[PDB]
């Protein structure tokens, strides 16, 4: 049959706002453990970490310090080493982060490899002389500035695509790409089953580092995803590695040309196993990053389709509406407004549990939480609103509250405060002080609330994951867009071994009258929200409530 992965469905934990149990404030290892059986209950198939090893946090646990040690605000070894025995127990599995473009600079092997010029980390990284008493060549770092940083102890330059702290791992050392498999089998011998290879498109160095062509500087991002070796290398690391497990491994894919997705992830080509990509989540935000830009639904579906099309035959997508860096899904594809949210949100989850995929819910959502009301620029977490604020309000492009305005309806940090538990202190997260804000609105949005209401966002969220988990085709069937012009209701069959359903979804907050195609009929409704009824067996049309989602089989 089919992999597992193809029917599983993953719930994405950043677990720094997921659960504290010792009331620091930080989400931790236990905590996690701990709400392991709500995670069940709701029918999780695999949780995915954020990155949880050691790290001096200058970028979010993204510029890892020991690939084997924890991260020491979430626990011990132990910790973690518990928290995969209790999956295992409760037959979960586990994803996680793998962050093997860069490491920190206070790596080992960093610290050993910047000390001289003939040692034998030297070639970990990438070191190379200045010309013309400037940087090596005109390459910019994505984080701003240059991409080349000086160590005055032997007066060359490392490189480093992001930040300073974080010096690229070279790749084109055998030694090294052989530290790092070892490294993937320490994790992967302790029972972890995915990994989620970030900024994967960059492992691959241009050799001779020539300079970017002035076009190319204005895509600086699509030109570091060209670096030649990099499917041999991705090759290279499944034949080592992924050969010799049943793990699934993903791709963090950015900066490359859509056409190349399918390198990636075409099982036949033996790399990885599905693609994440960004150009849904990215579809309204403007070029300056912080503000949004309007997009209809017929915006939303077109962009859905070509990149399930570039999966094709051999290919796999991930299929998510929020994640760690984005604001909260119901706020930002949904209407989070009193009247609608609820109804919205669950809309959002049979879009979510019905696309052709394999589905990613971000923490919270499933409770339908939304982006947190900020007040001012002070209560922003958020290390890119400073940088914001320097490039366009001291600049004098924007004003202090234009900023303001803006960036909360963009800001990751929607995406950061805490898990709403319960309706006690700090919403149950922590018995101490949060490290972010919890959401005022937690009184009325809360897990305890909503798991004994059969009413609610959360138990229309398990109600679709079991059905999902009981009907082939809504994972692993065909999709077909009714009408991608169409910008009301969305519209889409999904259909294996000579079943076929219809998902239609109401993305407006008024009534719709939807007529199937011509010859399609309803034979069953298998769930709908904000409905009264559903239709006839039979019926040729659907009469659409505000926000109304189902899913029918038809005849
Ligand atoms: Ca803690």
């Known amino acids: 049959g089919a ?50 090893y050691a790290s001096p946090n200058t970028d979010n646990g993204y510029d890892i310090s020991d690939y084997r040690e924890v991260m020491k605000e979430y626990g011990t070894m132990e910790d973690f080493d518990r928290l995969m025995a209790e999956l295992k127990k409760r037959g979960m599995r586990l994803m996680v982060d793998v962050v093997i473009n860069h490491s920190s600079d206070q790596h080992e092997w960093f610290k050993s490899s910047r000390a001289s010029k003939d040692n034998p980390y030297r070639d970990y990284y990438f070191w190379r002389d200045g010309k013309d008493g400037h940087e090596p060549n005109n390459y910019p770092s994505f984080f701003g500035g240059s991409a080349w940083e000086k160590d005055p102890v032997t007066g060359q330059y490392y490189l480093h695509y992001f930040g300073r702290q ?23 011998d302790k029972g972890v089953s995915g990994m989620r290879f970030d900024t994967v498109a960059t492992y691959s160095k241009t050799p001779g580092f020539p300079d970017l062509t002035p076009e190319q500087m204005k895509n600086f ?87 399930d099309a570039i999966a094709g035959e051999y290919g796999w997508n991930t299929f998510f509406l929020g994640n760690h860096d984005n604001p909260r899904a119901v706020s930002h594809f949904g209407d989070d407004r009193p009247q ?43 290390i890119e609103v400073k940088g914001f604020f320097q490039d366009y309000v001291e600049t004098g492009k924007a004003t202090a509250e234009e900023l303001l305005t803006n960036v909360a309806l963009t800001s990751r940090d929607n995406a950061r405060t805490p898990f709403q538990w319960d309706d006690s202190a700090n919403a149950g997260f922590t018995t101490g002080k949060p490290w972010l804000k919890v959401n005022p609105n937690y009184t009325e949005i809360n897990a305890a609330r909503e798991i004994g209401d059969p009413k609610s966002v959360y138990s229309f969220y398990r109600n679709l994951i079991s059905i999902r988990h009981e009907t082939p085709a809504l994972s692993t069937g065909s999709y077909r867009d009714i009408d991608p012009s169409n910008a009301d209701v969305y519209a889409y069959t999904r259909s294996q071994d000579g079943e076929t359903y219809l998902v239609v979804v109401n993305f407006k907050a008024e009534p719709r009258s939807f007529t199937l195609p011509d010859g399609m009929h309803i034979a069953e409704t298998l769930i709908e929200s904000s409905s009264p009824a559903a239709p006839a067996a039979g019926a040729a049309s659907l009469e659409l409530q505000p926000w109304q989602s189902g899913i029918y089989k038809v005849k």
């Open 3 to 52: 992999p597992w992965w193809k029917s599983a469905v993953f719930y994405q934990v950043y677990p720094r706002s997921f659960k504290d149990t010792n009331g620091d404030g930080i989400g931790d290892f236990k905590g996690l453990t701990e709400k392991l059986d709500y995670l069940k209950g709701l029918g999780i198939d695999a949780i995915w970490i954020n990155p949880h």
């Open 166 to 188: 974080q010096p690229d791992l070279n790749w084109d050392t055998p030694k090294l790409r052989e530290e790092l498999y070892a490294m993937l089998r320490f994790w992967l």
């Open 340 to 382: 609608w949210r609820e109804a919205s949100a669950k809309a959002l989850a049979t879009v979510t549990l019905t696309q052709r995929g394999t589905p990613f819910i971000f923490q919270g959502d499933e409770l339908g939480m939304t982006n947190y009301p900020f007040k001012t620029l002070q209560d922003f977490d958020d």
């Open 221 to 307: 991002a699509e030109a570091y995803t060209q670096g030649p070796n990099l499917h041999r290398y991705l090759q290279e690391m499944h034949e080592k590695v992924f050969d010799h497990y049943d793990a699934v491994t993903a791709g963090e894919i950015f900066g490359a040309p859509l056409n190349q997705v399918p390198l990636f992830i075409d099982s036949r080509r033996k790399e990885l196993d599905m693609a994440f990509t960004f150009d849904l989540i990215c579809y309204d935000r403007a070029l300056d990053r912080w503000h949004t830009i309007p997009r209809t639904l017929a915006d939303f579906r077109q962009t859905i389709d070509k990149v």
